[PDB]
Amino acid sequence: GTRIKKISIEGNIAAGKSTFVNILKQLSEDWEVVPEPVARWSNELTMEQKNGGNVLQMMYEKPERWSFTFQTYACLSRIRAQLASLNGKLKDAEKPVLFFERSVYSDRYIFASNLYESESMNETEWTIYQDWHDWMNNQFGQSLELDGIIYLQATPETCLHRIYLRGRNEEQGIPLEYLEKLHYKHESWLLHRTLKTNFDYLQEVPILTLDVNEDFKDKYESLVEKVKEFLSTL
Amino acid sequence: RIKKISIEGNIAAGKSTFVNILKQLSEDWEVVPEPVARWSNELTMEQKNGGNVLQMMYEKPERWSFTFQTYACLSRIRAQLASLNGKLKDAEKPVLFFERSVYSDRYIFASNLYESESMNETEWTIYQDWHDWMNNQFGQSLELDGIIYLQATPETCLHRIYLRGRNEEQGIPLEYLEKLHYKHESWLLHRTLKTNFDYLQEVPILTLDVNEDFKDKYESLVEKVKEFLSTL
Ligand SMILES: CCCc1sc(-c2ccc(OC)c(OCCF)c2)nc1CSc1nc(N)cc(N)n1
Ligand SMILES: CCCc1sc(-c2ccc(OC)c(OCCF)c2)nc1CSc1nc(N)cc(N)n1
Ligand SMILES: O=c1ccn([C@@H]2O[C@H](COP(=O)(O)OP(=O)(O)O)[C@@H](O)[C@H]2O)c(=O)[nH]1
Ligand SMILES: O=c1ccn([C@@H]2O[C@H](COP(=O)(O)OP(=O)(O)O)[C@@H](O)[C@H]2O)c(=O)[nH]1
C-alpha cells in the first residue's frame, strides 16, 4: 500500500496483456507499466537485449538445455525492470499504480514449474532455481510484493489465433497443447486456487479475473470499469 | 569494523588447512569455508544440490559450468552474509577470513571456464551481468579489507590433491592446475587484471609462499598475517 500500488497482469501467451497495459497506461497519468523483459527480447540495443534474443532463440531450439539459463535471466531482468520503475517513475501522484506485465511468481509457478514437469529441467535444475528464487525474493521486504493480480482469462484457441495475428516468426511453432498446460496452470493458481506457493501472503492477495476472449481493442470500457472498481478495494 | 580478508589460491594449495590453523589462534578470528569445498566431500538441500551439480560439472563441464558458477557464487554470497550478520559478535578486533571470494568466482574460475570454452559468450555475459548486480543489491557489505594469496606451484598442488585422497579429484590433470595458476599470478602477483569493482584496485594484497609443508611450522606465515592486519 506504500506508496505506489503494484498490480500484476497475468495470462497465457498472447492472451492480450500488452494490448491491455498499453490501454490502461493512457487512461491515467497516475498509472504506469513495467512490460515483460522477454516480450522485448522477441523482436543498436543493450546488453540484456543482446543476451535476451540469443537465449530466447536457443530456448526455442533446445529447451532441455536452455530452460535453466533462460528462466534465471528472465527473472533477473524482471526484478531489475520492476525495481527500477518503483522509485524511477510516479514520484508525484495522488494515487499511483504500477501495472506489471507478469510477476516473479508466474516466472516460477507457471513457466519454470511447467518446464520442469515437461522434463526441460532436471530435478537439480529445478531445486537450484527454486533456491535462487527464494533467497532473493526474500531479500526484498515488501517492495515488489503485489497488492493484487489481474488475471486476463482466455482460451488456448484465442491465444493460438492471436499468435498468428501477432506474426512472431518463431512463435508460430508453439503448439496448442503447450498453451493448454500453461492455461491449466493459470486456472489452477489464479482461478481454482489449487497451487500453494512458498510465499505466504499470496493466498490472501486479491485477484481480479477477466474473460478477454472477445476482441477488446475497440470496446474496453467494461474491462477498465472492473479494473477501477477492484483498485478501490485494495 | 569487522575486517574482511579473502584467502585465495589454487586447488590443493593449502587454503582450508591455513584458515583452520588461523581460527584456532584467536577468539576474535573467524572463518567462512567455501561452499564448493563443502560439496567436495545427513545434511541440507544445498549439499544435495551442490553434491549433484559438482558431479555433473566433472562429467560434462561444457553443459554444467554456467549453472555451477551461478550456484557456487550465490551459495558463497549467502554463506558470507550469515557469518557477517551472526558471527564475531561483538569482539574487540573482529576479522573474518573468507575461503576465496566472489572475485575469484568470477575473475578466475568462471573466466577460466569461458576461455577453455565451457561457457559460450551468452552464458559468460549473462553470468557477469548476474554477477555485477547480485553483488550490488545483496553483496555490498562484503567488500574486502584485504586479500591473502597462498602461492604454491601446480606440481605442489597435484601432490596435495593426491594427499587429500578425494577420488573424484584424482583425475584432475596437471594442465588444468597450470591454467588456474596463471590466472592467480596476473590478478594477485603482477596485479595486471582490471575489474568493474574499482575499490578492488586499492585493496592491499599479501603474498605467502606455501610450497614447504606448514602444518607443524606456520609461525612465520602467521606473523606476516598479524603484520598485514595491523597495516589495516
Ligand atoms: C513465449 C516465449 C518464451 C518461451 S519459448 C518456449 C518454448 C520454445 C520451444 C519449446 O519446445 C521446442 C518449448 O517447449 C518447452 C518444453 F516443453 C518452449 N517457452 C517459452 C515460455 S517460458 C517463459 N518463462 C518466463 N519466465 C517468462 C516467459 N514469458 N516465458
Ligand atoms: C574443485 C571442484 C570444482 C571444479 S571441477 C572442475 C572441472 C572438472 C573437470 C573438468 O574437465 C572434465 C573441467 O574442465 C573445465 C574445462 F577444461 C573442470 N573445475 C572445478 C573448479 S571451478 C570452481 N569455481 C568456483 N567458483 C569455485 C571453485 N572452488 N571451483
Ligand atoms: O482484443 C485484442 C487483443 C489482442 N489482439 C492481438 O493479439 C495479439 C497478441 O496480443 P498481445 O501481444 O497483447 O498478447 P500478450 O502476449 O502480451 O498477452 C496482438 O497482435 C494483438 O494486437 C487483438 O487483435 N485483439
Ligand atoms: O602445508 C601443507 C599444505 C597442505 N597439505 C595437505 O594438502 C591437502 C590439500 O590442502 P587443503 O585442503 O588445505 O587445500 P585447499 O584446496 O583448501 O587450498 C590437505 O589434505 C593437506 O593435508 C599439507 O599436508 N601441508
CA-B18 nearest atom, ligand 4: 13
SS3 of A178, please? helix
CATH number of the domain encompassing residue B6: 3.40.50.300
Q: Are B77 and B171 in contact (CB under 8 A)?
A: no
Q: Is the CB of B164 under 6 A from ligand 4?
A: yes
Distances (CA, A) of A62 to A119, A121, B137: 12, 11, 32
Which residues of A belong to the annotated binding site for ATP?
Answer: 11-19, 162-166, 214-216
| Closest to B147 measured CA to CA, from B220, B33, B232 | B232
CA count, 13 A, side-chain hemisphere, B121: 7
Q: Which phi-psi region, left, alpha or beta, contains residue A54 (left: φ > 0; alpha: ψ -120 to 50)?
A: alpha
Q: What is the DSSP letter of A39?
A: H
Q: For ligand 4, atom 23, name the residue with the nearest CA.
A: B213
CA of B73, nearest ligand number: 2
- The count of domains in chain A is 1
Q: Choose from A82, A124, A140 for mutation: most chain B CBs within 10 A.
A: A124
Other C-beta atoms lying within 10 Å of the C-beta of residue A1? 8
- For residue B185, the Cα-to-chain-centroid distance in whole angstroms is 15
User: Distance between CA atoms of A62 and A97, rounded to whole angstroms?
Assistant: 38
Element of type H or E holding A201: none
C-beta atoms of A51 and B125 within 8 A: yes
DSSP string, chain B: --EEEEEE--TTSSHHHHHHHHHTT-TTEEEE--HHHHHT----HHHHHHHHHHHHHHH-HHHHHHHHHHHHHHHHHHHHHHHHTTSSTT-SS-EEEEES-HHHIIIIIIHHHHHTTSS-HHHHHHHHHHHHHHHHHH-GGG--SEEEEEE--HHHHHHHHHHH--TTTTT--HHHHHHHHHHHIIIIIS-----S-THHHH--EEEEE--S--TT--HHHHHHHHHHHHT-
Q: Which residue from A47, A128, A135 is facing B67, i.e. has the nearest CB?
A: A128
Which residues of A belong to the annotated binding site for substrate?
Answer: 36, 60, 71, 102, 107, 171
Whether B62 has a binding-site annotation, put simply, is: no
The pairing of beta strand B29-32 with beta strand A5-10: unpaired
Grid coordinates representing A180?
493448454
- Amino acid identity, position B221: L
Q: Is the CB of B158 under 6 A from ligand 4?
A: no
User: Distance between CA atoms of A183 and B208, rounded to whole angstroms?
Assistant: 60
Q: Which residue from B56, B63, B126 is facing A73, i.e. has the nearest CB?
A: B126
- Amino acid identity, position A174: I
Element of type H or E holding A18: helix A17-25
User: Distance between CA atoms of A134 and A138, rounded to whole angstroms?
Assistant: 6
* Centre of ligand 1 from the C-alpha of residue A75, in Å: 13
Element of type H or E holding A197: none
Quick one: three-class SS letters along A90-150?
Answer: CCCCCCCEEEEECCHHHHHHHHHHHHHHCCCCCHHHHHHHHHHHHHHHCCCCCCCCCCEEE
Distances (CA, A) of A50 to A41, A106, B129, B146: 8, 23, 12, 36
C-beta atoms of A124 and B52 within 8 A: yes
User: Distance between CA atoms of B91 and A95, rounded to whole angstroms?
Assistant: 48
Q: Choose from B56, B67, B120, B141 for mutation: most chain A CBs within 10 A.
A: B67
Q: Which residues pair with B150 in a beta bridge?
A: B208
User: Distance between CA atoms of A100 and A10, rounded to whole angstroms?
Assistant: 9
Domain that holds residue B62: 1-232
Distances (CA, A) of A33 to A23, B12, B78: 10, 52, 32
Burial of residue A150, with CB atoms counted within 10 A of its CB: 0-12 exposed, 13-18 middle, 19 or more buried: buried
Please report the resolution in angstroms. Answer: 2.2
- Amino acid identity, position B73: C
CA count, 13 A, side-chain hemisphere, A191: 15
Buried/exposed code over B77-114 (b: 16+ C-beta within 10 A; e: otherwise): bbbbbebbeeebeeeeebbbbbbbbbbbbbbbbbbbbb
C-beta atoms of B133 and A80 within 8 A: yes
A101 is catalytic: yes
Burial of residue A225, with CB atoms counted within 10 A of its CB: 0-12 exposed, 13-18 middle, 19 or more buried: exposed
Backbone angles phi, psi at B222, to 5 degrees: -70, -40
Backbone angles phi, psi at B104, to 5 degrees: -70, -30
Q: Distance, in angstroms, between B221 CA and closest chain A CA? A: 38
Residue A135: closest CA among chain B residues belongs to which residue?
B78
Distances (CA, A) of A11 to A20, A101, A111, A194, A227: 11, 9, 11, 17, 15
Q: Are A44 and A185 in contact (CB under 8 A)?
A: no
Experimental approach taken: X-ray
- Neighbouring residues of A147: CB distance < 8 A, sequence distance ≥ 6: A1, A5, A6, A7, A205, A206, A234
* Centre of ligand 4 from the C-alpha of residue A31, in Å: 60
- For residue B231, the Cα-to-chain-centroid distance in whole angstroms is 23
Element of type H or E holding A195: none
